[PDB]
mmCIF file of C-alpha atoms and ligand atoms in Angstrom:
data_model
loop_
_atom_site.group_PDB
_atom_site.id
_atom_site.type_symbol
_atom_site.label_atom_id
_atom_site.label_comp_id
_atom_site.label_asym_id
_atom_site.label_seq_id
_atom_site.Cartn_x
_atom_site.Cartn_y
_atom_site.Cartn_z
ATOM 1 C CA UNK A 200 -160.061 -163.165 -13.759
ATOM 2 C CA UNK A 201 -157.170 -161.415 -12.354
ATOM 3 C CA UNK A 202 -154.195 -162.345 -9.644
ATOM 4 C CA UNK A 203 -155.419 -163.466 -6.563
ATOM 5 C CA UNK A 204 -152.646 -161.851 -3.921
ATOM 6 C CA UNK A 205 -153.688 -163.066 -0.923
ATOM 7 C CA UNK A 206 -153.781 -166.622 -2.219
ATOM 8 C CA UNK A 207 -149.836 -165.761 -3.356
ATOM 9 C CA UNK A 208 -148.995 -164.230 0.288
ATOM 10 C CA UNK A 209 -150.370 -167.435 1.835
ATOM 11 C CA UNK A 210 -148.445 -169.776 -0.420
ATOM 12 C CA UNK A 211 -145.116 -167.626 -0.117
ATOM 13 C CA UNK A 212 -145.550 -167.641 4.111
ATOM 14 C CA UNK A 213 -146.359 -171.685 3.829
ATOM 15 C CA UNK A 214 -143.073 -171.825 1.648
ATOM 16 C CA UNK A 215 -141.553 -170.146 4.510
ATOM 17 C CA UNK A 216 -142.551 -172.499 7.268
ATOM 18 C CA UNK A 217 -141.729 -175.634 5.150
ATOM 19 C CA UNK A 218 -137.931 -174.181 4.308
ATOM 20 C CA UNK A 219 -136.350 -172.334 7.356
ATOM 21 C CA UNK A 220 -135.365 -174.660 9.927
ATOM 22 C CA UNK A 221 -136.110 -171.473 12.414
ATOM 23 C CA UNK A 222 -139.213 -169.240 12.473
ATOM 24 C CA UNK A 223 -140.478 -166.375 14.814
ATOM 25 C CA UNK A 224 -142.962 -168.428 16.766
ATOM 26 C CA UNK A 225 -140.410 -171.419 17.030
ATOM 27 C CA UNK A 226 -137.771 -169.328 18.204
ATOM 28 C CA UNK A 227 -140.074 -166.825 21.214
ATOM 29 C CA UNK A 228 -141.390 -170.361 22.060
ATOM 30 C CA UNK A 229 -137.789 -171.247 23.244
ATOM 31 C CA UNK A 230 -136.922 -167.880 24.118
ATOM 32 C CA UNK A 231 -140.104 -168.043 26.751
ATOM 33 C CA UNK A 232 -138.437 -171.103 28.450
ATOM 34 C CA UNK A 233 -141.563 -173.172 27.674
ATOM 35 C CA UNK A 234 -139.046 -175.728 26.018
ATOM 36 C CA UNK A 235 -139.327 -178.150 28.086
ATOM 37 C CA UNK A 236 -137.135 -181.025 26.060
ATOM 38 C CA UNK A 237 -133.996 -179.989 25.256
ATOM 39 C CA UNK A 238 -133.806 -176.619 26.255
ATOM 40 C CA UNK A 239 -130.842 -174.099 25.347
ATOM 41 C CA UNK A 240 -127.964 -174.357 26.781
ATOM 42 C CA UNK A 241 -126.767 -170.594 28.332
ATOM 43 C CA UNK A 242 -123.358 -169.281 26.764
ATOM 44 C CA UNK A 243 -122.375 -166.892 28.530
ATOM 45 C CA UNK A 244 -118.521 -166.740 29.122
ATOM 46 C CA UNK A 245 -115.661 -169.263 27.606
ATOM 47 C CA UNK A 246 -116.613 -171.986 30.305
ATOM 48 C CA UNK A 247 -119.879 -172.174 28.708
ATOM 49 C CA UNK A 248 -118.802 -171.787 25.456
ATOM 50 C CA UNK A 249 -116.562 -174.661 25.578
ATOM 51 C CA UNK A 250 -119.554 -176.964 27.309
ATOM 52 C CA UNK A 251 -121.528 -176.463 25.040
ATOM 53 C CA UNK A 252 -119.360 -177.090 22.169
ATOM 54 C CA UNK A 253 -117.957 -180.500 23.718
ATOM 55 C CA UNK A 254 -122.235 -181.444 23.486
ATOM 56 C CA UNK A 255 -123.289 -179.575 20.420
ATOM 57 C CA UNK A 256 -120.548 -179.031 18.242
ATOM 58 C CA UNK A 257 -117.780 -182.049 19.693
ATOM 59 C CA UNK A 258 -116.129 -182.721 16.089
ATOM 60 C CA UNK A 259 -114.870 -179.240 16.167
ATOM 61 C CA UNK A 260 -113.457 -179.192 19.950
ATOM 62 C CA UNK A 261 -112.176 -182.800 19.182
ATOM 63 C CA UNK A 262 -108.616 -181.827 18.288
ATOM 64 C CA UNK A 263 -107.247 -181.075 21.411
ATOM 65 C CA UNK A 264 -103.607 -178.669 21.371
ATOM 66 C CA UNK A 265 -104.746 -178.565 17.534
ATOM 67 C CA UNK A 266 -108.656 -177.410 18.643
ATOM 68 C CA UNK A 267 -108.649 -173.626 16.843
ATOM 69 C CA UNK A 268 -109.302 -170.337 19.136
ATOM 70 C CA UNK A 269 -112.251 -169.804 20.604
ATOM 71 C CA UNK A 270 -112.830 -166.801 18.623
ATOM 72 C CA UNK A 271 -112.459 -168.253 15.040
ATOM 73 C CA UNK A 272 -114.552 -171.661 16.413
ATOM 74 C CA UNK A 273 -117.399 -168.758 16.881
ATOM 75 C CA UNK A 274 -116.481 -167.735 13.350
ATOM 76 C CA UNK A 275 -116.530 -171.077 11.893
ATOM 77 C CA UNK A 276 -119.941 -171.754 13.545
ATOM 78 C CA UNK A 277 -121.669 -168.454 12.378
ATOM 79 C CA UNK A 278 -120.474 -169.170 8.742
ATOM 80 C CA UNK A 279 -122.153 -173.142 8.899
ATOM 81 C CA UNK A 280 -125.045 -171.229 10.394
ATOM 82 C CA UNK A 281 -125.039 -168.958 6.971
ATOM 83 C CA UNK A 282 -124.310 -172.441 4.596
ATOM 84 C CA UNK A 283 -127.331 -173.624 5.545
ATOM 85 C CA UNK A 284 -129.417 -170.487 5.514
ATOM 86 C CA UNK A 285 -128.189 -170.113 2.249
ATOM 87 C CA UNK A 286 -129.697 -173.447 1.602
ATOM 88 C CA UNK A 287 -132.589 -172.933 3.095
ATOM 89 C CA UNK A 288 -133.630 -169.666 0.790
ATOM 90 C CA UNK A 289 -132.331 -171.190 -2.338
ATOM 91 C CA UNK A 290 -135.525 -173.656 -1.894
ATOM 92 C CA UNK A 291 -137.529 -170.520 -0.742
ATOM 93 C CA UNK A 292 -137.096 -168.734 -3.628
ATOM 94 C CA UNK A 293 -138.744 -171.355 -5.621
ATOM 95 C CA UNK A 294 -142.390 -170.178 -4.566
ATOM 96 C CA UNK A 295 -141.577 -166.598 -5.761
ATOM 97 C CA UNK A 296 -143.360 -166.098 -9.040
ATOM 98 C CA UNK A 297 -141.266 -165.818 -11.922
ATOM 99 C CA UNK A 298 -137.975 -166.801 -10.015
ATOM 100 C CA UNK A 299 -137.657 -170.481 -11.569
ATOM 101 C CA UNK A 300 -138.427 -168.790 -14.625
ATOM 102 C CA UNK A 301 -135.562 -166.821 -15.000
ATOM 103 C CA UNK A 302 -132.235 -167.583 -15.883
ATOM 104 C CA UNK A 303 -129.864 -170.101 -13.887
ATOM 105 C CA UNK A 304 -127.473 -167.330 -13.886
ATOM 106 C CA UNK A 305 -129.513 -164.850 -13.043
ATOM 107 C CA UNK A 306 -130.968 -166.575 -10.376
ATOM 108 C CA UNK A 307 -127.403 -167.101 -9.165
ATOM 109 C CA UNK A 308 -126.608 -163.107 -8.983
ATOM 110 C CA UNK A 309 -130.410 -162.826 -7.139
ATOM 111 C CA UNK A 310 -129.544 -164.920 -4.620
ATOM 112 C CA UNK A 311 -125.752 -164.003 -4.197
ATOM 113 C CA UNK A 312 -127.155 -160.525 -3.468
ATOM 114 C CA UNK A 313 -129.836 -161.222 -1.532
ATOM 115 C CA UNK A 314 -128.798 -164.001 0.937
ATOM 116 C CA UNK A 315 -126.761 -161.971 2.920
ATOM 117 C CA UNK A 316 -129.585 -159.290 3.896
ATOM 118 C CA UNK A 317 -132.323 -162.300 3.714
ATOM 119 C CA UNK A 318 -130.041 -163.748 6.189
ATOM 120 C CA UNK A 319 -129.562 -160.701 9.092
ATOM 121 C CA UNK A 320 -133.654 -159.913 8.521
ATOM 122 C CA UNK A 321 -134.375 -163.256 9.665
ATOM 123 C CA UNK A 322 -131.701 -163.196 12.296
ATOM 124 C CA UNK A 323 -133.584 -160.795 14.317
ATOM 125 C CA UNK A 324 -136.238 -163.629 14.860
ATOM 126 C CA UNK A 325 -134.107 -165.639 17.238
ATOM 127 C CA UNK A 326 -132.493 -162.073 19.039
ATOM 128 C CA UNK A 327 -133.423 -160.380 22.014
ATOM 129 C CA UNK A 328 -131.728 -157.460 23.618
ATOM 130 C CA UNK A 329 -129.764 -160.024 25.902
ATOM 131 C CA UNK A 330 -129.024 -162.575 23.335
ATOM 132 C CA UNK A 331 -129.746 -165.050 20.316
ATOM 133 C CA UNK A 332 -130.624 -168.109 19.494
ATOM 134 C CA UNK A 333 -128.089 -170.850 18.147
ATOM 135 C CA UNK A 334 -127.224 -174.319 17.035
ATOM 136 C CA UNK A 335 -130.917 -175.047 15.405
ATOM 137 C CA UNK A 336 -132.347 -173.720 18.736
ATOM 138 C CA UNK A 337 -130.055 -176.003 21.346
ATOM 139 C CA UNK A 338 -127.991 -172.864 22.094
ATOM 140 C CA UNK A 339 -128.526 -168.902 23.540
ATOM 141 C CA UNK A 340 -125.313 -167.460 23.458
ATOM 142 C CA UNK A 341 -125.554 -163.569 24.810
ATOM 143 C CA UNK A 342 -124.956 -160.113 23.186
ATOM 144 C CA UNK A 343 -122.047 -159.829 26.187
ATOM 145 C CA UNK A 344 -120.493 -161.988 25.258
ATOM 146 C CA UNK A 345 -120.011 -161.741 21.828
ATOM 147 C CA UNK A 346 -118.908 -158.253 23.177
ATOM 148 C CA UNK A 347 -116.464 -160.048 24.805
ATOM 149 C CA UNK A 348 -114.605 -161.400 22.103
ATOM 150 C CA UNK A 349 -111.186 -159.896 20.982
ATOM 151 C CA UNK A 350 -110.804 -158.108 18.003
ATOM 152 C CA UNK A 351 -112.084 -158.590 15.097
ATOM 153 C CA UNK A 352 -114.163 -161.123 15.848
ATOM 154 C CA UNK A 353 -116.341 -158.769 18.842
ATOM 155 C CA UNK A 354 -117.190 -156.576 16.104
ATOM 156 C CA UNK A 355 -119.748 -159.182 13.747
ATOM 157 C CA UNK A 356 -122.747 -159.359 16.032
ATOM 158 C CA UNK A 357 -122.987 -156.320 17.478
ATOM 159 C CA UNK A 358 -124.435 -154.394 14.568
ATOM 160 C CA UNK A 359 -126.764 -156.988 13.849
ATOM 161 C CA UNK A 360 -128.106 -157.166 17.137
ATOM 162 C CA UNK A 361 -129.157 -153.302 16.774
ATOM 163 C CA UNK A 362 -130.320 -153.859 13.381
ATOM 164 C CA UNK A 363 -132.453 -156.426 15.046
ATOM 165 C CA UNK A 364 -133.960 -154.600 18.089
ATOM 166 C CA UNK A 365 -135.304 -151.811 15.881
ATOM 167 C CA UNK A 366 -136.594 -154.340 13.440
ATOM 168 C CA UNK A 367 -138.386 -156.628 16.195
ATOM 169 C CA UNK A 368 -139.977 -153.248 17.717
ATOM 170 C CA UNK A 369 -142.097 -153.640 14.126
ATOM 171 C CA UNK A 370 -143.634 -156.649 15.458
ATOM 172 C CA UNK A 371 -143.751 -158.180 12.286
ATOM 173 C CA UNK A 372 -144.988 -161.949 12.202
ATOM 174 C CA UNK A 373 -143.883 -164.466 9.870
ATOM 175 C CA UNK A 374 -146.311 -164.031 7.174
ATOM 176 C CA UNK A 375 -144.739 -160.532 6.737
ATOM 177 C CA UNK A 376 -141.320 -161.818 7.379
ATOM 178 C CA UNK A 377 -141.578 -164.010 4.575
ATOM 179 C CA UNK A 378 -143.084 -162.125 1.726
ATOM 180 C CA UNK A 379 -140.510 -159.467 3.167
ATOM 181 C CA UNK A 380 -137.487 -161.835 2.221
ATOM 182 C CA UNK A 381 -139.293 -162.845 -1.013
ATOM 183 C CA UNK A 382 -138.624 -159.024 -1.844
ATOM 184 C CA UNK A 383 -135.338 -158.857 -0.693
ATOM 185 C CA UNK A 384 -134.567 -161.759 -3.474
ATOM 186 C CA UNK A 385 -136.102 -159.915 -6.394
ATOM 187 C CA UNK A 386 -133.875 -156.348 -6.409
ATOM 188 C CA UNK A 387 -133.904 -155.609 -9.974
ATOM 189 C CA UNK A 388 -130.630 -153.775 -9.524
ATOM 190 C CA UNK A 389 -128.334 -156.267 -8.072
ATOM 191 C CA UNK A 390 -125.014 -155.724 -9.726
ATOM 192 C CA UNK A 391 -124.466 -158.262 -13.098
ATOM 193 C CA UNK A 392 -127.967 -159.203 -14.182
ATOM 194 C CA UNK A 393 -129.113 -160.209 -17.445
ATOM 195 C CA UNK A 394 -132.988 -160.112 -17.542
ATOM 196 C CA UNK A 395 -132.879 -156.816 -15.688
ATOM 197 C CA UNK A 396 -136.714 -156.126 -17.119
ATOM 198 C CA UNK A 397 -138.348 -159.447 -16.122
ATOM 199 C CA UNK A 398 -136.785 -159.273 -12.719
ATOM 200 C CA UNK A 399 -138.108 -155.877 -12.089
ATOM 201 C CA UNK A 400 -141.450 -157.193 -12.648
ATOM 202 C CA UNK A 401 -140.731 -160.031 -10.498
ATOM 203 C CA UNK A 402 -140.001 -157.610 -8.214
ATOM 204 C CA UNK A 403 -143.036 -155.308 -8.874
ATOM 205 C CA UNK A 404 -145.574 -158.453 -8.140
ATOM 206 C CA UNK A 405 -143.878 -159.787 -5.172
ATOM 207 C CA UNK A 406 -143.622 -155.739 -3.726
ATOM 208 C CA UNK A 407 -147.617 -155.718 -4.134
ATOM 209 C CA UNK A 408 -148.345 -158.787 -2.576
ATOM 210 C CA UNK A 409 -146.057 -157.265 0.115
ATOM 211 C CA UNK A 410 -147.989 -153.972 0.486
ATOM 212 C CA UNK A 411 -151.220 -155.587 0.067
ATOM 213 C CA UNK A 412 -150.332 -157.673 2.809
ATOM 214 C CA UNK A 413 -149.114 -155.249 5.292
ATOM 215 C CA UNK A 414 -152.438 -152.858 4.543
ATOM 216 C CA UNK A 415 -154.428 -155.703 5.240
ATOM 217 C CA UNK A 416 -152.068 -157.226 8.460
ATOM 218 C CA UNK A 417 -150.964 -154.386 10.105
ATOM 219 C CA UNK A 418 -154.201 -151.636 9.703
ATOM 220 C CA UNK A 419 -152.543 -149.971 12.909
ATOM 221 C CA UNK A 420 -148.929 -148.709 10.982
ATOM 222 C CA UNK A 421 -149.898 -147.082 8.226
ATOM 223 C CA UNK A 422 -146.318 -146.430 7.013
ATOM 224 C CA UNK A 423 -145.523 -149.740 7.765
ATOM 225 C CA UNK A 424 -144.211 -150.810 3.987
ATOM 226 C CA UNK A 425 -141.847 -147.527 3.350
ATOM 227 C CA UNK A 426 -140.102 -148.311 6.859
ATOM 228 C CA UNK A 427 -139.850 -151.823 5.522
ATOM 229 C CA UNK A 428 -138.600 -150.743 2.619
ATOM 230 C CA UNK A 429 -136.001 -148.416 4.278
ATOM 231 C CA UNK A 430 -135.159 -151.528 6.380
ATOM 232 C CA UNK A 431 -133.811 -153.436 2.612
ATOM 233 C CA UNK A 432 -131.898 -150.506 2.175
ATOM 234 C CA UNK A 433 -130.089 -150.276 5.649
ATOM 235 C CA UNK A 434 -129.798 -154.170 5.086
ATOM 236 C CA UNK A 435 -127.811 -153.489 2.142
ATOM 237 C CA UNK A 436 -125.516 -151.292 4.355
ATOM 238 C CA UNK A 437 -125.494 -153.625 6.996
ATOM 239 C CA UNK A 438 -124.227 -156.491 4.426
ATOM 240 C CA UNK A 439 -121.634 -154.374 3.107
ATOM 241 C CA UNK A 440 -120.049 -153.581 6.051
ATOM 242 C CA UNK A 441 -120.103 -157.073 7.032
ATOM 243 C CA UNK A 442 -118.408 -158.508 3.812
ATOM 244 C CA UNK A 443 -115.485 -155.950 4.724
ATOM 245 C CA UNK A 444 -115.126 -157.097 7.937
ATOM 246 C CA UNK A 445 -115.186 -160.179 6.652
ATOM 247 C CA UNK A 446 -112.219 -159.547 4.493
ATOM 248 C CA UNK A 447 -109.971 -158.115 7.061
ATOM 249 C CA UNK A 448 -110.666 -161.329 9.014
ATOM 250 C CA UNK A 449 -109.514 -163.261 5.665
ATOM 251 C CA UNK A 450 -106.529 -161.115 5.248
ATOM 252 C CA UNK A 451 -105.493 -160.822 9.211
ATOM 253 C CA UNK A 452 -106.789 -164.024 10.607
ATOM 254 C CA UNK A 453 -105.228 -167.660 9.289
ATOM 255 C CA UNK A 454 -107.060 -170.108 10.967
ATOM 256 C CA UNK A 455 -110.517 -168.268 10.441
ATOM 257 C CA UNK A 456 -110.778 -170.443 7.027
ATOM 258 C CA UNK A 457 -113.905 -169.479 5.019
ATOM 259 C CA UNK A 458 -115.850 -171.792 3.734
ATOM 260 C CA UNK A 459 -116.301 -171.855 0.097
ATOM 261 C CA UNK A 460 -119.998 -171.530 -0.708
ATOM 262 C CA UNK A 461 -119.325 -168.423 1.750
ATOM 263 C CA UNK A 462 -116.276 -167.456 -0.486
ATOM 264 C CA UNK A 463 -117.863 -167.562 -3.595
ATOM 265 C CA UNK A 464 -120.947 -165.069 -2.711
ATOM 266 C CA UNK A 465 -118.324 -162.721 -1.487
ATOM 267 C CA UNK A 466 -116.377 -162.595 -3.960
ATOM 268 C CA UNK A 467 -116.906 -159.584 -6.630
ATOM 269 C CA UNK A 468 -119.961 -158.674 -4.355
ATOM 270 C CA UNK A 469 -119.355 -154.855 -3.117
HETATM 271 C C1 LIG B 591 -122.326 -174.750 20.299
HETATM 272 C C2 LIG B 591 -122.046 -174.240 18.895
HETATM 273 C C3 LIG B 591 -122.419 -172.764 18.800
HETATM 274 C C4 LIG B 591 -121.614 -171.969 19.821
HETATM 275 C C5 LIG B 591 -121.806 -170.487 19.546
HETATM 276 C C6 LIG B 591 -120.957 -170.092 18.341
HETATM 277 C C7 LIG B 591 -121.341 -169.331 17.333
HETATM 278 C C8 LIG B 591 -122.709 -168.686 17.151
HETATM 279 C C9 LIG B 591 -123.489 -169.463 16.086
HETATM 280 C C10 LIG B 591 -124.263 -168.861 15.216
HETATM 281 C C11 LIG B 591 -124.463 -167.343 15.136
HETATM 282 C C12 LIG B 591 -125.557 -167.038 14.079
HETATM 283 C C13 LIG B 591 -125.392 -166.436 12.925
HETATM 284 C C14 LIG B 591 -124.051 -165.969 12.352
HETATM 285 C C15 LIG B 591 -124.099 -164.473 11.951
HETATM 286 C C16 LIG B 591 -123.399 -163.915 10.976
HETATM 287 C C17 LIG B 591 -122.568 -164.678 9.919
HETATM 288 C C18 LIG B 591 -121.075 -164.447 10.017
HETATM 289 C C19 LIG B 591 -120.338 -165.442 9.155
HETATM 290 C C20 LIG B 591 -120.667 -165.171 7.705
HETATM 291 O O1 LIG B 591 -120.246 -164.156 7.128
HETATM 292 O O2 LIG B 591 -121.340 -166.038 7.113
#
């Protein structure tokens, strides 16, 4: 007669596979080179950039003398790859309990918050030390040469990437993963919230599946949940550095247009 948690983990980890287009074992299957159909193209310098875009992306590289630099193309194709993470959580967030019982609004501010860090967790899934995964697994553009880059636009990966080789040295699967982003979503301090007591409850429940989970997953790092939960907090770091890079790039950069789902979570966020 009381909650059954592990039943909740599983359903939260299915809701993961159904929603994200990418997922851990998807993207080391790839990463292995076992991908036999269709396997990534290399970018690796602006040659193989500019291949790959002519197959993968062609709309954008379509204009000719009017086709943008290759720097704020990259730009333009990181922020469709947030749009439609974005997406992809919004449904997520559905199997969290007590989310679709909140408020529209507040589930607004929730996920306004929360994409962003949801977002560079998951990211780590599809990068190694050498690289990452792109273009709904069709691309593996390297850490190089995103170093490569000028100015500004060399500075966005990089701190991901060393967010992510710390957090793939957890070995974390995706039935952690997911209940991990489930927590991310329900912060009952994000900034503007309404129901601040139901969320934190929200939050409470999801946190113990969470731990619960781990204990059970993971009997070998015992002080596996506090580092995760330091990880949300350097997450929240990591995002707010990245939303002021972000704005210099929007103040400095005129072609790098942002798009305006992407617009609208920045705005009044840190
Ligand atoms: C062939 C097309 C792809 C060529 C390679 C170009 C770009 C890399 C694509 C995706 C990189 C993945 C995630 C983007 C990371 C951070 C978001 C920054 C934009 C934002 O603040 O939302």
């Amino acid at each position: 007669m009381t909650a059954d948690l592990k039943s909740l983990a599983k359903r939260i980890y299915e809701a993961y596979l159904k929603n994200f287009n990418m997922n851990k074992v998807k993207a080391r299957v790839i990463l292995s080179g076992k991908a036999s159909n269709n396997p990534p193209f290399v970018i690796h310098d602006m040659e193989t950039l500019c291949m790959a875009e002519k197959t993968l992306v062609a709309k954008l590289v379509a204009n000719g003398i009017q086709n943008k630099e290759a720097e704020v193309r990259i730009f333009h194709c990181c922020q469709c790859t947030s749009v439609e993470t974005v997406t992809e959580l919004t449904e997520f967030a559905k199997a969290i309990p007590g989310f679709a019982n909140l408020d529209l609004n507040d589930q607004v501010t929730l996920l306004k918050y929360g994409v962003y860090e949801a977002i560079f967790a998951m990211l780590s899934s599809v990068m190694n030390k050498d690289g990452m995964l792109v273009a709904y697994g069709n691309g593996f553009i390297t850490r190089e040469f995103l170093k490569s880059l000028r100015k500004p636009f060399c500075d966005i990966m990089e701190p991901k990437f060393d967010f992510a080789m710390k957090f793939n040295a957890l070995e974390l699967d995706d039935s952690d993963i997911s209940l991990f982003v489930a927590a991310i979503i329900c912060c009952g301090d994000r900034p503007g919230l309404l129901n601040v007591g139901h969320i934190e409850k929200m939050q409470e429940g999801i946190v113990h599946v969470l731990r619960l989970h781990l204990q059970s997953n993971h009997p070998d790092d015992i002080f596996l949940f506090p580092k995760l939960l330091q990880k949300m907090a350097d997450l929240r770091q990591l995002v707010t550095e990245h939303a002021q890079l972000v704005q210099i790039i929007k103040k400095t950069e005129s072609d790098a247009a942002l798009h305006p789902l992407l617009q609208e979570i920045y705005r009044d966020m840190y």
